[PDB]
Design an enzyme around this catalytic site. Structure first.
Site, PDB file in Angstrom:
ATOM      1  N   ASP A   1      32.649   8.715 115.688  1.00 35.11           N
ATOM      2  CA  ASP A   1      32.987   9.853 116.568  1.00 35.11           C
ATOM      3  C   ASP A   1      32.749  11.183 115.836  1.00 35.11           C
ATOM      4  OD1 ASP A   1      34.015   8.476 119.132  1.00 35.11           O
ATOM      5  OD2 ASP A   1      35.695   7.943 117.800  1.00 35.11           O
TER       6      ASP A   1
ATOM      7  N   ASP B   1      31.046   7.005 109.632  1.00 40.53           N
ATOM      8  CA  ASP B   1      31.932   7.169 110.753  1.00 40.53           C
ATOM      9  C   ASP B   1      31.108   7.267 112.073  1.00 40.53           C
ATOM     10  OD1 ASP B   1      34.436   7.907 111.883  1.00 40.53           O
ATOM     11  OD2 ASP B   1      33.419   9.929 112.172  1.00 40.53           O
TER      12      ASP B   1
HETATM   13 MG    MG Z   1      34.965  10.784 113.439  1.00 36.70          MG
END
Ligand code: MG
Ligand code: PIN
Length: 291
Positions: A45, A43
Site C-alpha cells: 500500500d 511493502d
Molecule cells: Mg504501505
C-alpha cells in the site's frame, strides 16, 4: 562505475538523497551481483500502489473493502471514527514505537471486526477490486516484468488484506511466479464468507516479527545477498530482518505525506527518499543497470 548525476531518473525533484556517494557504492554492488544475487522486499500500500490521483487519495487494500457496495454507510462512519482516534496515536510524536503496538493491534482488530460483520464473500472480491479506485504506481508493468523475466524473487510484505492485494496484482497481470505475498489473509466459512483473519496480525510496527517467521522463504534464497527494499513507513525498514546473508541492501522510501515533519528522519533512515512520487522509475532505472 555508478554516477547518479548521469541518471536522469535521479534528477527529478522528488528524489532526496542524504548520502549520494554511499548510494552509488550500494548500487555499484547491486550491479556487480547481477540477477543471481538480487531479491526484492517490498511493502504494497502506497509503495507499489499510488497514494493519490487528482487530489483524491487512492485506496489502500483495506479501503477497497471499506468503500465497496457490500459495506453500509454506518459501517464506514464507524471505520472513520476508528481511524481518527487510532491514527492520532500512530503519528503521536511523544509515544515510543513500542508503546504504539497495543493500539495498532486494537485498531486493526476492531476494523477487521467491522468488516467481518458486513458479510464479505470471497466470490465477490474480483468485482469489488474491478470496481474500485485502486491504482498501481506508474512503471509497474516494467517493474514486475523485468523482475519476472530474470526470475528475481519479490517478497511483498503487507499490513493490508492479502486477498485484496493478490486480486489487484492478478487483475493488473503482474502476479507472476517470482512474487510471494505475505499479508493478513481472510478466513472464510463453509459458505465462502469472511469470518476472521489467518495467522498472526501484521501491522505497521511489527514487521520484524513476520520477517523472522519466514525462514523457509529466506533460507532458500541464501545466495540472494543483494537486496532492494521499498517502503513508505519507518516500520518497513524492518522488512529485511529475516534475510540470511546481506552483501548490499538499498533502502528506497516513499514519503507520501507529513513531508515537513518526516523528511529529515526519512533521509536519515532510507538511502533514497521519493517525495510525493507516484512512479517506480528510480527503482526501474536501478534494475535496468543491474539485470
Ligand atoms: Mg504501505
Ligand atoms: O549482469 S549480466 O552480465 O548477466 C547482464 C548484463 N546487463 C545487460 C544489460 N545492461 C544494460 C546496460 S545499461 O544501459 O543498463 O548500463 C546492464 C547489464
Amino acid at each position: 562505475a555508478v554516477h547518479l548525476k548521469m541518471m536522469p531518473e535521479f534528477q527529478k525533484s522528488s528524489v532526496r538523497i542524504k548520502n549520494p556517494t554511499r548510494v552509488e557504492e550500494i548500487i555499484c554492488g547491486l550491479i556487480k551481483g547481477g540477477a543471481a544475487k538480487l531479491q526484492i522486499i517490498t511493502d504494497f500500500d502506497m509503495t507499489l500502489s499510488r497514494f493519490s490521483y487528482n487530489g483524491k487519495r487512492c485506496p489502500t487494500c483495506h479501503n477497497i473493502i471499506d468503500n465497496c457496495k457490500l459495506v453500509t454507510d454506518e459501517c464506514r462512519r464507524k471505520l472513520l471514527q476508528l481511524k481518527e482516534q487510532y491514527y492520532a496515536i500512530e503519528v503521536d510524536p511523544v509515544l515510543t514505537v513500542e508503546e504504539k503496538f497495543p493500539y495498532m493491534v486494537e485498531w486493526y482488530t476492531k476494523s477487521h471486526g467491522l468488516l467481518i460483520e458486513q458479510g464479505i464473500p470471497k466470490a465477490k472480491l474480483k468485482e469489488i477490486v474491478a470496481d474500485s479506485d485502486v491504482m498501481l504506481k506508474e512503471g509497474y508493468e516494467n517493474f514486475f516484468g523485468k523482475l519476472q523475466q530474470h526470475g528475481i524473487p519479490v517478497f511483498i510484505f503487507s499490513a493490508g488484506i492479502g486477498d485484496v492485494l493478490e486480486e489487484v496484482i492478478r487483475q493488473a497481470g503482474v502476479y507472476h511466479s517470482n512474487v510471494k505475498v505475505v499479508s493478513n489473509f481472510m478466513d472464510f466459512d463453509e459458505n465462502g464468507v469472511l469470518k476472521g483473519f489467518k495467522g498472526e496480525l501484521i501491522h505497521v510496527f511489527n514487521k520484524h516479527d513476520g520477517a523472522l517467521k519466514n525462514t523457509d522463504y529466506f533460507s532458500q534464497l541464501k545466495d540472494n545477498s543483494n537486496i532492494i527494499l521499498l517502503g513508505d513507513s519507518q516500520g518497513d525498514l524492518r522488512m529485511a530482518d529475516g534475510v540470511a546473508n546481506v552483501e548490499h541492501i538499498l533502502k528506497i522510501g516513499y514519503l507520501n505525506d507529513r513531508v515537513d515533519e518526516l523528511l529529515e528522519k526519512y533521509m536519515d533512515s532510507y538511502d533514497i527518499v521519493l517525495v510525493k512520487e507516484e512512479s517506480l522509475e528510480v527503482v526501474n532505472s536501478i534494475l535496468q543497470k543491474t539485470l
